[PDB]
Amino acid sequence: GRDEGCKLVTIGSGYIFATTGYGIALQKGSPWKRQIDLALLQFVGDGEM
Amino acid sequence: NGMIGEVVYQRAVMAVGSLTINEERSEVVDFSVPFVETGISVMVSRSNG
Amino acid sequence: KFANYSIMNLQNRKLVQVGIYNGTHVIPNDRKIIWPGGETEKPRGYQMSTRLKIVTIHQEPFVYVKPTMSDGTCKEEFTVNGDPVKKVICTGPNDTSPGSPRHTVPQCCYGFCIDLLIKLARTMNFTYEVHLVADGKFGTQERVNNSNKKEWNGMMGELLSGQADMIVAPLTINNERAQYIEFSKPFKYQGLTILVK
Amino acid sequence: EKENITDPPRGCVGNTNIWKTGPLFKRVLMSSKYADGVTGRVEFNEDGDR
Amino acid sequence: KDLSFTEEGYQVHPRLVVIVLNKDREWEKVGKWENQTLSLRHAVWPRYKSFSDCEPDDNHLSIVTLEEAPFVIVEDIDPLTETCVRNTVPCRKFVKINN
Amino acid sequence: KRHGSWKIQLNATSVTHKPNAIQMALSVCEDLISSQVYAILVSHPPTPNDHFTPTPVSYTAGFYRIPVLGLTTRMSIYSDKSIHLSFLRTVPPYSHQSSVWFEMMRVYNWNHIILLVSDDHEGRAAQKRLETLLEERESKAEKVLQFDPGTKNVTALLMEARELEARVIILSASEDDAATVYRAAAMLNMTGSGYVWLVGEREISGNALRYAPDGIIGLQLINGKNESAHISDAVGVVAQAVHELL
Amino acid sequence: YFRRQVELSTMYRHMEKHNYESAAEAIQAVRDNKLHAFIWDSAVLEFEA
Amino acid sequence: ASIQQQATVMLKIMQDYDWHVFSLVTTIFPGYRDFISFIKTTVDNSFVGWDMQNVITLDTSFEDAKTQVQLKKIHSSVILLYCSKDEAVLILSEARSLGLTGYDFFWIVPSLVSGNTELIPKEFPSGLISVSYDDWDYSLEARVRDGL
Amino acid sequence: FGDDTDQEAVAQMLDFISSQTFIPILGIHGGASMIMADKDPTSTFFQFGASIQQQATVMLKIMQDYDWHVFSLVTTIFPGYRDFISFIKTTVDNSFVGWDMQNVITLDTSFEDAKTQVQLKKIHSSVILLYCSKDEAVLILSEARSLG
Numbered sequence A: 001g002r003d004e005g006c007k008l009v010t011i012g013s014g015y016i017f018a019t020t021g022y023g024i025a026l027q028k029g030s031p032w033k034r035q036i037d038l039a040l041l042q043f044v045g046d047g048e049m
Numbered sequence B: 001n002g003m004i005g006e007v008v009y010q011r012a013v014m015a016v017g018s019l020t021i022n023e024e025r026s027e028v029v030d031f032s033v034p035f036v037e038t039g040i041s042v043m044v045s046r047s048n049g
Numbered sequence C: 001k002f003a004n005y006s007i008m009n010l011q012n013r014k015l016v017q018v019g020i021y022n023g024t025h026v027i028p029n030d031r032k033i034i035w036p037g038g039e040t041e042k043p044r045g046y047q048m049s050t051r052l053k054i055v056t057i058h059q060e061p062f063v064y065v066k067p068t069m070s071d072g073t074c075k076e077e078f079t080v081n082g083d084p085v086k087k088v089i090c091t092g093p094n095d096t097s098p099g100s101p102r103h104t105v106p107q108c109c110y111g112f113c114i115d116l117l118i119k120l121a122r123t124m125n126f127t128y129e130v131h132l133v134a135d136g137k138f139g140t141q142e143r144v145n146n147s148n149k150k151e152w153n154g155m156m157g158e159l160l161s162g163q164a165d166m167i168v169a170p171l172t173i174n175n176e177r178a179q180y181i182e183f184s185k186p187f188k189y190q191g192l193t194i195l196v197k
Numbered sequence D: 001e002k003e004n005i006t007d008p009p010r011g012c013v014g015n016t017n018i019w020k021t022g023p024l025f026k027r028v029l030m031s032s033k034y035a036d037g038v039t040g041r042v043e044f045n046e047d048g049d050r
Numbered sequence E: 001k002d003l004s005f006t007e008e009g010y011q012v013h014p015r016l017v018v019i020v021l022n023k024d025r026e027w028e029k030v031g032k033w034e035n036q037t038l039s040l041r042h043a044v045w046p047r048y049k050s051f052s053d054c055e056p057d058d059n060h061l062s063i064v065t066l067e068e069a070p071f072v073i074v075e076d077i078d079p080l081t082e083t084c085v086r087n088t089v090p091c092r093k094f095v096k097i098n099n
Numbered sequence F: 001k002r003h004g005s006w007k008i009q010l011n012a013t014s015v016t017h018k019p020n021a022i023q024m025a026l027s028v029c030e031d032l033i034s035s036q037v038y039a040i041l042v043s044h045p046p047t048p049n050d051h052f053t054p055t056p057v058s059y060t061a062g063f064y065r066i067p068v069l070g071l072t073t074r075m076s077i078y079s080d081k082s083i084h085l086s087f088l089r090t091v092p093p094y095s096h097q098s099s100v101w102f103e104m105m106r107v108y109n110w111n112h113i114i115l116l117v118s119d120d121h122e123g124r125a126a127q128k129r130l131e132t133l134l135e136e137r138e139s140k141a142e143k144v145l146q147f148d149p150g151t152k153n154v155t156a157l158l159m160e161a162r163e164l165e166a167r168v169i170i171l172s173a174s175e176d177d178a179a180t181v182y183r184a185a186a187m188l189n190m191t192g193s194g195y196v197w198l199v200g201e202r203e204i205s206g207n208a209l210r211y212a213p214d215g216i217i218g219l220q221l222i223n224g225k226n227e228s229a230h231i232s233d234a235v236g237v238v239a240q241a242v243h244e245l246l
Numbered sequence G: 001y002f003r004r005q006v007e008l009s010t011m012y013r014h015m016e017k018h019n020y021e022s023a024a025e026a027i028q029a030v031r032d033n034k035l036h037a038f039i040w041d042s043a044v045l046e047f048e049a
Numbered sequence H: 001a002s003i004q005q006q007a008t009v010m011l012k013i014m015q016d017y018d019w020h021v022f023s024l025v026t027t028i029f030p031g032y033r034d035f036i037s038f039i040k041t042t043v044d045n046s047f048v049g050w051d052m053q054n055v056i057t058l059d060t061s062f063e064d065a066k067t068q069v070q071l072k073k074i075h076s077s078v079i080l081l082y083c084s085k086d087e088a089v090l091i092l093s094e095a096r097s098l099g100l101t102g103y104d105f106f107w108i109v110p111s112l113v114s115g116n117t118e119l120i121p122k123e124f125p126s127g128l129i130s131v132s133y134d135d136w137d138y139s140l141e142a143r144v145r146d147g148l
Numbered sequence I: 001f002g003d004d005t006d007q008e009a010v011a012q013m014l015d016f017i018s019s020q021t022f023i024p025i026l027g028i029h030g031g032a033s034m035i036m037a038d039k040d041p042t043s044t045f046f047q048f049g050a051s052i053q054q055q056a057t058v059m060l061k062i063m064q065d066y067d068w069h070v071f072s073l074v075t076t077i078f079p080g081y082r083d084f085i086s087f088i089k090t091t092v093d094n095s096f097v098g099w100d101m102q103n104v105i106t107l108d109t110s111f112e113d114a115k116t117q118v119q120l121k122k123i124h125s126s127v128i129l130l131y132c133s134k135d136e137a138v139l140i141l142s143e144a145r146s147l148g
């Protein structure tokens, strides 16, 4: 999406690949974890993401 | 090393940036919920043809 | 405020004082915490969930539901790759309650999430029981006839009532469901789209 | 009519501590509302004028 | 010492002193001023967790990240006013002298 | 003695038992209105009437909003500030025992709990206090139960509790209901090993003490039946409050 | 109008290099391929097209 | 120093620390209209895009009824107080009483608010940011020698 | 029995009569018909009126017909209040309207006009809901006329 030359249309859409997500690493037992999860689901749950 | 070494040795609270999800990180720290669908892919030469 | 209480034990029809309690602090004495079973130690009475109750909805790419062959049996059929279809004896209703009056039978369930559950049973040593949901809904925060209170129905309603143990379904992970129960990490990354002709 | 009646002391002999109810007495002068007077209805505004 | 005067009777180049309070009830001399620009000794600002007796501060979250182009765009500070533009956030980067 | 040289004096008024509670409240209000009293102390635990109703005295004093400092009862109908308006006391109710039970959760690191209450009046307040305690840890109980006392076929609910995966049994009931569920527990394997029995003080009196399983853990008040020193502390509280009001 | 905007400061940091005096400067600069883009009112550029 | 140069230095500190959400609280203590006007122009001069909460103005000695409402309107990070020294003690004691002395709640005052470094009163948070020029390093004997 | 005064506890006394005489007693007017908190199945006393939840439903139906969505709730500890506040909170939780409910102003005792004035000056909504006794409401309305 920023390529100069535009010779790059990638292999599929992630079919045969790792297929993971991105997350936030916290300490094992942090009290912030549930609140951060609810905040991320609020940020996806309104189209702001 | 890196952000994992900063969080496990507790010189930081959390890591916000792009971070993959595998077994050893879930052993040493705790991920949040995933917010973006980001797997892996392969960029090749992919000429005109 | 700050009520001193006494912690008593009944040692064979005899009241025995085995502790005290301050306004905020428990003080055990030098007596024996005698239990009705074995040792004086605490019984960790949290069983490891040997038998599990699995509920799902009729999801055509995930849960194929098919009536049995003769009586409660499942035919070992093959795929295009020669894979034997690892089925399970699920128990579910026939149709909706206006549709079917009362017909809840064990039938054969297979497909995607059944194979996922069999992989999970290969991972950890446990047993399970696959069953179905009474209605045909996922579950929403829906009103009830009294109390001015919305409760849960569907698979969430059957799980929060204690009738189930683990929902294996395409769990639409949103903010509302996460406020009440804990989740797993998503096996499937899947969005929304529009079906047209 | 109010409380904390304090007086400005003999500040010309060894006293530099200010009179603490200065702004209090000034606020008393601010709320000076009157309807009598040969010059007329006298009352102080927020700037302390006629 | 350029002790020149303005039209209102003020020093053209005075000595601006920036102090704070420690827990030892002392005014610590922190920052002085040059002829034009501000001199700050502590680039990392000390948080001073105990302003008073009872202050449990559990809301200062130490956060580290990694430089990647579609997510973490890191640039230098502005050369004109030495200011991050307001749609960005500040950070510090530890750079050693040599090997 | 030590409350200054204030010019107030004191006088006593005390009324005894009558079987008819109507004439009890009649003699009470005759002694309250004609004396212009300030503080009222109800001090009858061992009444042969099993209703245990100091209600009309507090309702007569609440007609002009006079605080009665009771000394005997521990019910949620008296703990409420809605119906009983200003009926204060220096005795704790049973619901705060759940807080102690939450401290028991902080003793043995026990999380998954099961609640069984025969009553509904105190049971809702006990459920609210216990859910407040669980919200302080941000967790939930596995199963809570409220029902109607009197019957004997609550054994099926105990067998459903057997089908659960926690063994923490928290009970709140009167004497006869506790004896009934202890008989059901003895007839359904529930007095063996692993079971967690943690009750209050109503379960260790009468036949509830008789049919209790050997090894049960319970709570007890301190200076709960010592009533004279309770009167003395109440009079000290009342006298210092009256001097502070004057 | 771009200075009131809350997120287009990158365009402000880019256009500060080539702030031109007259519009004919920009017309001659894109005419001699010195520029690559230019923001202007519509009908003026419609006439100059 | 002038009040204008000192306000410029304090806004330079805020520029170096990027505490963009702030307020401005003044009494009728003198040198205040030019101070508030210089702050308003400097915010209007800035392309930084500062977040300025509205100016709280204190009239007289507090009844802690209207001034409590004026102090409970404050929800920003940096509080700029411009008053006398005793009024600074009173306002900080009220903010400590009202809980307005938190970790978020910063306090940057000039020299005329703070006063002499030889005496430090109570009701001060450990971290009270101030700008003065009563240096114990650059001695008073050096000051009078430079004046001579 | 129909009472002329403003004392609902009279009916509570009648409730005690319903605990003793076992007579079906109908509260007709005034405090005999003023709604108490929670009756008893052993009591055969009955009033003429509606519950506080039904009248709350009527008032929220008025607010629904008028679209006065930004509202508040000023409550003392006058009884029947926990169920009323709980009913309002559940109605906000059961709202397709999207009711802008300002947080509940609470009154512990009679007003000191020091902290209660702060809770009254936090009101920035349109509909101010009051639930207390008679003379307490007269004092609160006189304070609101005093506070504008």
Ligand SMILES: *[C@@H]1O[C@H](CO)[C@@H](O)[C@H](O)[C@H]1NC(C)=O
Pocket: C022, C023, C024, C025
């Ligand atoms: C309750 O018990 C201990 C020992 O009696 C006492 O020192 C303290 O006041 C209480 N607990 C605490 C807070 O340590």
Ligand SMILES: *[C@@H]1O[C@H](CO)[C@@H](O)[C@H](O)[C@H]1NC(C)=O
Pocket: C094, C095, C100, C103
């Ligand atoms: C279950 O539903 C189907 C719907 O066609 C019906 O044909 C079948 O008879 C039902 N099963 C029984 C035996 O009730």
Ligand SMILES: *[C@@H]1O[C@H](CO)[C@@H](O)[C@H](O)[C@H]1NC(C)=O
Pocket: C124, C125, C126
């Ligand atoms: C089966 O589960 C038991 C616990 O009930 C465990 O001890 C055993 O190791 C498991 N066996 C295997 C091979 O999974």
Ligand SMILES: *[C@@H]1O[C@H](CO)[C@@H](O)[C@H](O)[C@H]1NC(C)=O
Pocket: C144, C145
């Ligand atoms: C009560 O609940 C049922 C559930 O199906 C619903 O159909 C009905 O509309 C509700 N209302 C009544 C009549 O109480």
Ligand SMILES: *[C@@H]1O[C@H](CO)[C@@H](O)[C@H](O)[C@H]1NC(C)=O
Pocket: D003, D004
């Ligand atoms: C005088 O003012 C102070 C506050 O400056 C106040 O605390 C006190 O109540 C007032 N007067 C007295 C001594 O009551």
Ligand SMILES: *[C@@H]1O[C@H](CO)[C@@H](O)[C@H](O)[C@H]1NC(C)=O
Pocket: D038, D039, D040, D041
């Ligand atoms: C207003 O003008 C009139 C006429 O001069 C005179 O009474 C006086 O100067 C002023 N004051 C008032 C309010 O009467």
Ligand SMILES: *[C@@H]1O[C@H](CO)[C@@H](O)[C@H](O)[C@H]1NC(C)=O
Pocket: E034, E035, E036, E037
């Ligand atoms: C301070 O003065 C010196 C000359 O004495 C000059 O070189 C320097 O640039 C001045 N400081 C600044 C950075 O303004």
Ligand SMILES: *[C@@H]1O[C@H](CO)[C@@H](O)[C@H](O)[C@H]1NC(C)=O
Pocket: E097, E098, E099
């Ligand atoms: C010393 O600094 C220079 C850049 O100023 C560069 O060669 C390198 O960063 C350092 N030397 C080495 C070899 O690390």
Ligand SMILES: *[C@@H]1O[C@H](CO)[C@@H](O)[C@H](O)[C@H]1NC(C)=O
Pocket: E098, E099
């Ligand atoms: C310095 O040089 C060595 C050469 O091997 C290299 O391994 C190391 O990473 C460099 N970094 C340090 C220690 O500054």
Ligand SMILES: *[C@@H]1O[C@H](CO)[C@@H](O)[C@H](O)[C@H]1NC(C)=O
Pocket: F011, F012, F013, F035
């Ligand atoms: C105290 O009260 C009684 C009535 O209860 C009455 O005789 C008189 O008011 C006082 N008498 C005594 C005993 O002081």
Ligand SMILES: *[C@@H]1O[C@H](CO)[C@@H](O)[C@H](O)[C@H]1NC(C)=O
Pocket: F152, F153, F154, F155, F156
């Ligand atoms: C109560 O009811 C059940 C119903 O099956 C019956 O078996 C028994 O009489 C009671 N409970 C027990 C002991 O199973």
Ligand SMILES: *[C@@H]1O[C@H](CO)[C@@H](O)[C@H](O)[C@H]1NC(C)=O
Pocket: F187, F188, F189, F192
């Ligand atoms: C449990 O109770 C049954 C009777 O219902 C009895 O036969 C059995 O032996 C008991 N089992 C245990 C664990 O003692």
Ligand SMILES: *[C@@H]1O[C@H](CO)[C@@H](O)[C@H](O)[C@H]1NC(C)=O
Pocket: F226, F227, F228, F229
């Ligand atoms: C109650 O407590 C007091 C405390 O001193 C004690 O003297 C008394 O003996 C106890 N019991 C009685 C008989 O009142």
